[PDB]
Swiss-Prot record, chain A:
InterPro entries noted in UniProt: Bac_surfAg_D15, BamA/TamA_POTRA, D15-like, OM_assembly_BamA, POTRA
Designated name of the protein: Outer membrane protein assembly factor BamA
Main location: membrane
Keyword Repeat: yes
UniProtKB keywords: Cell adhesion, Cell outer membrane, Membrane, Repeat, Signal, Transmembrane, Transmembrane beta strand
Function: Part of the outer membrane protein assembly complex (Bam), which is involved in assembly and insertion of beta-barrel proteins into the outer membrane. Constitutes, with BamD, the core component of the assembly machinery. Efficient substrate folding and insertion into the outer membrane requires all 5 subunits. A lateral gate may open between the first and last strands of the BamA beta-barrel that allows substrate to insert into the outer membrane; comparison of the structures of complete and nearly complete Bam complexes show there is considerable movement of all 5 proteins.
Record annotation: effect of changing residue 441 to L: Very minor growth defect
Effect of residue 635 to C: No effect. Lethal
Outcome of mutating residue 236 to A: Lethal, protein does not accumulate
Domain of life: Bacteria
Keyword tRNA processing: no
From Swiss-Prot, chain B:
Transmembrane spans: none
Taxonomy, superkingdom: Bacteria
Species annotation: Escherichia coli (strain K12)
Protein name: Outer membrane protein assembly factor BamC
Subunit field text: Part of the Bam complex, which is composed of the outer membrane protein BamA, and four lipoproteins BamB, BamC, BamD and BamE. Forms a subcomplex with BamD and BamE. The Bam complex has the shape of a hat, with the BamA beta-barrel crown in the outer membrane and the periplasmic brim formed by the BamA POTRA domains and the 4 lipoproteins.
Curated annotation (Swiss-Prot), chain C:
Lineage, top ranks: Bacteria, Pseudomonadati, Pseudomonadota, Gammaproteobacteria, Enterobacterales
GO cellular component, one term: membrane
GO molecular function, one term: identical protein binding
Organism: Escherichia coli (strain K12)
UniProt family annotation: Belongs to the BamE family.
Name used for this protein in its record: Outer membrane protein assembly factor BamE
Span covered, complete protein: 24 to 111 of 113
Cellular localization per UniProt: Cell outer membrane
Curated annotation (Swiss-Prot), chain E:
Compartment(s) of residence: Cell outer membrane
Key words, A-Z: Cell outer membrane, Lipoprotein, Membrane, Palmitate, Signal
Listed InterPro entries: BamB, PQQ_b-propeller_rpt, PQQ_rpt_dom, Quinoprotein_ADH-like_sf, WD40/YVTN_repeat-like_dom_sf
An annotated Gene Ontology molecular function: identical protein binding
Pfam families recorded: PQQ_2
Example GO biological process: Gram-negative-bacterium-type cell outer membrane assembly
Gene3D superfamilies xref list: YVTN repeat-like/Quinoprotein amine dehydrogenase (2.130.10.10)
Cellular component aspect of the GO annotation: Bam protein complex; cell outer membrane; membrane
Family listed: Belongs to the BamB family.
PROSITE patterns, alphabetized: PROKAR_LIPOPROTEIN
Membrane topology of the entry: Lipid-anchor
Protein name: Outer membrane protein assembly factor BamB
Length: 785, 56, 88, 212, 348
């Protein structure tokens, strides 16, 4: 009989104390142990991860245990890491098992090498070869010395499609992402290489949306040159002529809803087969069943082919599945953002029956906030229940303390400086604070804003503001004046819909006018306020305190955020002064931009913009000139100078410290100012109406994988500004600045792309319908702002 | 900035068992989240030396 | 309220009219649990009661919820069934 | 702006130097003197003191992720050391310091609760038991307060089923906490919104028989 | 990291007989378009589609046609192999051209399986084409009809193919892009045998010669094996070598590896004779025998003559600063090579 363990003994224990090894032993002093329990004991000591060579054997009456511990890591020095800093290389190793103070398994050294290599395949270092060097030390220690070597990187050199005849190869590679044909510096899309990953599904959707229902991608090869620095990509396809949708038949378990599904799967025979229309029907059923409380509905579609008529009958299989309920909705990883911030962006409720789509949308709303780095979902089955589940969201938060500067350039305003600092999570309540400023040729602005996105639990937002604005009219191509202003504006945002949003709030604004050159139109407003300045002096000052109620409505149904090809954008902003203010007026601005396509591919768009503006006094007073509307420039009507469209200033005979020496001035007494003087200097008006109409065309001189990036558009811009308070009778010798019939028109070409310097927009226009004083600015651009 | 060993926890409201009405009783208290009765008593807060003691 | 966005509000029970017929008086918890299960609300303490609340108030209107209360005995066998088309 | 490298000094000289850095209050240099002392002698006769002193150094220098790691190493290698009760206590303080002082991922206090519990169960007469118990009372209060905040949001939203199930969860795990009594009216109201006056009356009976 | 240009005391003066520019060449794109000598006439081409015919003595234009329409590049990357009054060129748009050696007109054109990167091989009345998607096809020499098609298994990550099949005793011995060299019947395309020569260090990441019943094939990683022509069983194995291409002269084997070092082996067991590591880590093309010496062109555009019995550099000459990508040609006592710009060079 064996083996009575009278005593235990150990040899080779350094870091591991006696108690730590005596713990993990499935056999202990006094037990009766054979060869089956020793083998279990040895394998137990090995599973401790403390040793690399364990040995248990008998003595006379004592069970002796011989061990050799794993080498304790002394330090980890990197050598040759150019692309990656030493600090993150450390953290990635600690999150893998290896770290200083701990121990290394000498059998995992190779896994550390290939493990670090794999990180160099995340980025394009396909020639990387990290070598690990292990060196012993006096005591049981070891200094890991990782030698890095990367000769890189790979620019994928060619993307080729084989089997295409209906469409040219260059046209197909224009829609993705990631391309590599020619990375022209114009062109923004850059050509590096990683997982595609579903760039075939775009090519798949291209043929499928146009009828090719049999379209099958046979094989995709990603080629490498003998030098591991060059990448090719070859995708072999097989197209399938013409296919008309003849009918849709529904099969499988329908959960008793055959009556409404026939509606969702109805078609008008016979029209061309469309993939996204099929995908729509698949999700429409998944959403219908989801409404009837179904967690994971499964809908699949297979096109049965009819070669005789070249038509396709769609076979659809439905499996409603089962019902599940959500016990708890937990949140892991939010050490900063309070629970309410994350939970407020849900659509799957706790307790309520489960919806797979409702869970996925929960992930979408979280990353759209941009508060977190990664958002992972995990629906866990509640222990001891067939249906109850726990939907848990794991998030790694992202620093929302951002410094952001910016520069710009454009004929409309020259160089522009944008500088400020914004915190989108202060201190993690969802609030958005930020001190932001800007600089321009004719305007300097700085603000301090605080915004709560969820003022109510429904989505209504409340935003505070504290601004300061300086305005120089002479640099804005207007009659010389200066309007120093500041104040505070609070406002509410009402999301009535995901397509419509309302705005409302109060605001206090102080306007301290100064350095105003005397002219008729401007001076008329001063009388209505109750002021009587000198018509011979440049020097003047006017402080006005105003309280305003504001209302706004923005409608946006544009399909694409960057280049709209279908949809419309409507914005209406209204202002009115509540009694108690110095001024008594109202202002209403309306902006409209609608896009209408005329083809299958949406590459021929007809954009029509309109912009309306009107304002006037209330109780005898008149609308301030620093609230006037203007037209002409890069944005309003192209072909005219900035704000040159509309009324012109009629200066009074004046003398000023200029210091009247030698050069040009306007109606100066030294230059013989006896009476009122006509000028080219525009002042804008309290009534403006412009309307554009451009024909968006495909760019004609590059037929590569380019044209879908640059947009040409032949336009016909036109508009008018006037003053509904101009006394046309008292100044009969001077033009009627109260007639809205003065419509100024133009026509030209445009160009658009996003460049390394920023988003550009060229516009070579030409005003054929222009009037007196109208200064023409034909070539206009904008590089940033 | 992170928390210093501070007396914020000595402000917490003490534990008191919830009384159950007649014709009624409370949910069964689970094993976890239960504080064993200790009569102590040693120094608490800043009065407790948290420096590591050892001899020899 | 009037015109605001208030996504969709559901609560834990979906009760079709052709699933409340499977429960006849005199059945155990197991049968009721695999017919329509599991009723999320069992209230402390002296009584056993499965509260099934077909709670559909996602839109601005309704406000449409029907509740189904079931009562067993000390040995887990159905004694009383209470269905109500709330609420008016 | 600390200094990294350490001279090759006598054994007692470094430890006597590191001690003075610890007694004064300068933890940043106290670490570096000790961090190199343990990274050169891991199994000396009193190298376990160095491991103990390191844990204390990381905790007072706001280095928590490093403290927990050193704690786990001392437990894994010395689970029966005469001062293992102190290491468990420092472990609890670390997780408690990773918390709020606020419904911000309460698992750090939920893990701290387990660390102090293991301390008072195995070592009732520990020199840190009384203070650990004071912390256990507070940790239990906010772990219930977390559920209250989740119940308060769903109250504003209108998830009554989620509310009563949460308060039920509160009454189960944390029945003797302050947040539990405050969450009781939330359970009653949620019942009245589902037209369960027979249930809300039961809750009302409990609320009336208890003052917070 | 690239070993610099070795200093060679020229045993003789390497000169350029003639130099004719052909199109824009292939550029930095890894193709295989090399000239082909036949009946004192040199046939070369660029990728764009331009195909010419030059005299092997002076390099004058006989005919110069383009294979493009309204231009779009014909994407010629496979070839050129000339036989039976036909010029065979493979393109990357799944096309195989057959030009008459008289005027340069298209005899026939055939749509193949995929990218015809492999140079055409003419055995019997069949033209062997190996595409990029592992499809060894045999096109009829007469009309170009696809007689049969063999599916060679595809790997995960791929190389630039490739394998130009060799033929002996009823069979076309071809290599794969996965690591298996295969042998198939010439008439049916029937599989005879398969042998795997490659080692796998997961997950870390070819023209054969038939000599007296012995098939020599090299692995994509650089493992060398001698195969029995009948069974396909490995005879001897050596773990060094690589792409580009090797050649067998009598009982010696000269080759260039991934590290672009030149070395000689024995036909018996493959033992080492000499090793040249001065052209180390350059970009040498394939080696070819031209009057006793090994000729290799690197990426900078230098040719390197090497003594075959000790590996000593015989000569060195700057030929084209554009560089060399495709393999040289040494037939009819002549020596051809095409730079990356498409310029063809005759030597000495």
């Amino acid at each position: 009989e064996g083996f009575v363990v009278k005593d235990i003994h150990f040899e080779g224990l350094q870091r591991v104390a006696v108690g730590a090894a005596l713990l993990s032993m499935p056999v202990r002093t006094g037990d009766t142990v054979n060869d089956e329990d020793i083998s279990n004991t040895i394998r137990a000591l090995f599973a401790t991860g403390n040793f690399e060579d364990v040995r248990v054997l008998r003595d006379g009456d004592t069970l002796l245990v011989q061990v050799k511990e794993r080498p304790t890591i002394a330090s980890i020095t990197f050598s040759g890491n150019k692309s990656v800093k030493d600090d993150m290389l450390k953290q990635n190793l600690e999150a893998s098992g290896v770290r200083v103070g701990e121990s290394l398994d000498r059998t995992t050294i190779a896994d550390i090498e290939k493990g670090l290599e794999d990180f160099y395949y995340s980025v394009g270092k396909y020639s990387a070869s990290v070598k690990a060097v292990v060196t012993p030390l006096p005591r049981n220690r070891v200094d890991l010395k990782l030698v890095f070597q990367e000769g890189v990187s790979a620019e994928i050199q060619q993307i080729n499609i084989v089997g295409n005849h209906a469409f040219t190869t260059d046209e197909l590679i224009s829609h993705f992402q990631l391309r590599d044909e020619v990375p022209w510096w114009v062109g923004d899309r850059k050509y590096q290489k990683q997982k595609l990953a579903g760039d075939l599904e775009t090519l798949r959707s291209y043929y499928l949306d146009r009828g090719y229902a049999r379209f099958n991608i046979d094989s995709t090869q990603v080629s490498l040159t003998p030098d591991k620095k060059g990448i090719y990509v070859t995708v072999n396809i097989t197209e399938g002529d013409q296919y008309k949708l003849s009918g849709v038949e529904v099969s499988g378990n329908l959960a008793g809803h055959s009556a409404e599904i026939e509606q969702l799967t109805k078609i008008e025979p016979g029209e061309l087969y469309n993939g996204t229309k099929v995908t729509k029907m698949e999700d429409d059923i998944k959403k219908l069943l989801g409404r009837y409380g179904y967690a994971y509905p499964r809908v699949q579609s297979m096109p049965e082919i009819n070669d005789a008529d070249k038509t396709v009958k769609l076979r659809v299989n439905v499996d409603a599945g089962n019902r599940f309920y959500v016990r708890k909705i937990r949140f892991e990883g939010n050490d900063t953002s309070k629970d309410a911030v994350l939970r407020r962006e849900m659509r799957q409720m706790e307790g309520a029956w489960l919806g797979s789509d409702l869970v996925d949308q929960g992930k979408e709303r979280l990353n759209r906030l941009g508060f977190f780095e990664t958002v992972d979902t995990d629906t866990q089955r509640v222990p001891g229940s067939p249906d109850q589940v726990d939907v848990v969201y794991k998030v790694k938060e992202r620093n929302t303390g951002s410094f952001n500067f910016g520069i710009g350039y454009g004929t409309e305003s020259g160089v522009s400086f944008q500088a400020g600092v914004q915190q989108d999570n202060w201190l993690g309540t969802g609030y958005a604070v930020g001190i932001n400023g800007t600089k321009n040729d004719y305007q300097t602005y700085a603000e301090l804003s605080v915004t709560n996105p969820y003022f109510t639990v429904d989505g209504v937002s409340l935003g505070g503001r504290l601004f300061y604005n300086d305005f120089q009219a002479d640099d804005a191509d207007l009659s010389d004046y200066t309007n120093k202003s500041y104040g505070t504006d609070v406002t509410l945002g009402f999301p009535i819909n995901e397509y419509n949003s309302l705005r409302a709030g109060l605001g206090y604004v102080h306007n301290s006018l100064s350095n105003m050159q005397p002219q008729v139109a401007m001076w008329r407003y001063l009388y209505s306020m109750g002021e009587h300045p000198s018509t011979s002096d440049q020097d003047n000052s006017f402080k006005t305190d105003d309280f305003t109620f504001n209302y706004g409505w923005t409608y946006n149904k544009l399909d694409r955020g960057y280049f709209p090809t279908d949809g419309s954008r409507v914005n209406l902003t209204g202002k009115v002064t509540i009694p108690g203010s110095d001024n008594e007026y109202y202002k209403v601005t309306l902006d409209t931009a609608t896009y209408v396509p005329i083809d299958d591919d949406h590459k021929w768009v007809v954009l029509g913009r309109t912009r309306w503006g009107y304002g006037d006094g209330l109780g005898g007073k008149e609308m301030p000139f620093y609230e006037n509307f203007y037209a002409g420039g890069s944005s309003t009507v192209r072909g005219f100078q900035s704000n040159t469209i509309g009324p012109k200033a009629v200066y009074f005979p004046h003398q000023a410290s200029n210091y009247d020496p030698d050069y040009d001035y306007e109606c100066a007494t030294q230059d013989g100012a006896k009476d009122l003087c006509k000028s080219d200097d525009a002042v804008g008006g309290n009534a403006m109406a412009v309307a554009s109409l451009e024909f968006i065309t495909p760019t004609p001189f590059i037929s590569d994988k380019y044209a879908n990036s640059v947009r040409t558009s032949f336009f016909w811009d036109m508009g008018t500004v006037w003053d509904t308070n101009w006394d046309s009778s008292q100044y009969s010798g001077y033009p009627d600045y109260s007639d809205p019939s003065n419509i100024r028109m133009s026509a030209g070409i445009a160009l658009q792309w996003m460049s390394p310097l920023g988003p550009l927009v060229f516009s070579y226009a030409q005003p054929f319908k222009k009037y007196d004083g109208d200064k023409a600015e034909q070539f206009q651009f904008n590089i940033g702002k | 900035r992170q928390v210093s060993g501070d007396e914020a926890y000595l402000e917490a409201a003490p534990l008191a068992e919830l009384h159950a009405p007649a014709g009624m009783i409370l949910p069964v208290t689970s094993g976890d989240y239960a504080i064993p009765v200790t009569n102590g008593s040693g120094a608490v807060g800043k009065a407790l030396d948290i420096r590591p003691p050892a001899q020899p | 309220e009037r015109v605001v966005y208030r996504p969709d509000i559901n609560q834990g029970n979906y009760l079709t009219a052709n699933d409340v017929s499977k429960i006849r008086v005199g059945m155990t918890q197991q049968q009721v649990a695999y017919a329509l299960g599991t009723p999320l609300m069992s209230d402390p303490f002296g009584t056993n009661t499965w509260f099934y609340v077909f709670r559909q108030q996602p839109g601005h209107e309704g406000v449409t919820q029907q509740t189904l209360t079931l009562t067993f005995n000390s040995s887990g066998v159905l004694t009383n069934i209470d269905n109500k088309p709330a609420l008016s | 702006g600390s200094k990294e490298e350490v001279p090759d000094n006598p054994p007692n000289e470094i430890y006597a130097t590191a001690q003075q850095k610890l007694q004064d209050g300068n933890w940043r240099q106290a670490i570096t003197q000790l961090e190199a002392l343990d990274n050169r002698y891991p199994f000396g006769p009193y190298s376990q003191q160095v491991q103990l002193d390191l844990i204390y150094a990381y905790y007072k220098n706001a280095d928590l992720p490093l403290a927990q790691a050193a704690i786990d190493r001392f437990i894994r290698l010395n689970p029966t050391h005469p001062n293992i009760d102190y290491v468990m206590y420092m472990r609890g303080l670390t997780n408690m310091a990773l918390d709020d002082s606020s419904d911000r991922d309460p698992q750090h206090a939920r893990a701290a609760f387990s660390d102090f519990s293991k301390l008072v169960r195995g070592y009732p007469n520990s020199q840190y038991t009384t203070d650990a118990t004071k912390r256990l009372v507070f940790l239990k209060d906010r772990l219930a307060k977390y559920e209250y905040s989740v119940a308060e949001y769903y109250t504003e939203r209108g998830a009554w089923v989620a509310v009563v199930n949460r308060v039920e969860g509160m009454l189960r795990d944390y029945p003797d906490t302050q947040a539990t009594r405050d969450a009781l009216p939330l359970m009653e109201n949620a019942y009245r919104q589902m037209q369960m006056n027979a249930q809300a009356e039961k809750v009302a009976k409990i609320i009336a028989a208890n003052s917070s | 990291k690239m070993s610099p240009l070795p200093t060679v005391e020229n045993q003789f003066t390497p000169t350029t007989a003639w130099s004719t520019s052909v199109g824009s060449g292939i550029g930095n794109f890894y193709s295989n378009l090399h000239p082909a000598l036949a009946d004192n006439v040199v046939y070369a081409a660029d990728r764009a589609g331009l195909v010419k015919a030059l005299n092997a003595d002076d390099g004058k234009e006989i005919w110069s046609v383009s294979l493009a329409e309204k231009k779009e590049p014909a994407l010629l990357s496979g070839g050129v192999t000339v036989s039976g009054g036909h010029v065979y060129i493979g393109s990357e748009k799944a096309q195989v051209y057959a030009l008459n050696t008289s005027d340069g007109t298209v005899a026939w054109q055939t749509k193949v399986a995929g990218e015809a990167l492999s140079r055409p091989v003419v055995s019997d009345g069949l033209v062997l084409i190996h595409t990029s998607n592992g499809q060894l096809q045999a096109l009829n020499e007469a009309d170009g009809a696809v007689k049969w098609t063999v599916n060679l298994d595809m790997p995960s990550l791929s190389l630039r193919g490739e394998s130009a099949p060799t033929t002996a005793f009823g069979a076309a011995v071809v290599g794969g892009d996965n690591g298996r060299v295969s042998a198939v019947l010439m008439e049916q395309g029937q599989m005879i045998w398969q042998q795997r020569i490659s080692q796998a260090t997961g997950s870390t990441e070819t023209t054969p010669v038939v000599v007296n019943g012995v098939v020599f094939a090299l692995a994509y990683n650089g493992n060398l094996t001698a195969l029995d022509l009948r069974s396909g069983q490995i005879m001897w194995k050596r773990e060094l070598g690589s792409v580009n291409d090797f050649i067998v002269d009598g009982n010696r084997i000269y080759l260039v590896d991934q590290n672009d070092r030149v070395m000689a082996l024995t036909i018996d067991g493959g033992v080492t004779l000499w090793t040249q590591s001065d052209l180390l880590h350059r970009l040498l093309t394939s080696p070819v025998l031209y009057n006793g010496n090994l000729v290799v062109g690197d990426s900078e555009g230098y040719l390197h003559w090497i003594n075959v019995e000790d590996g000593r550099f015989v000569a060195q000459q700057k030929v084209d600063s554009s560089g060399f990508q495709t393999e040289p040609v040494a037939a009819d006592g002549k020596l051809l090579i095409q730079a990356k710009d498409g310029t063809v060079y005759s030597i000495t």
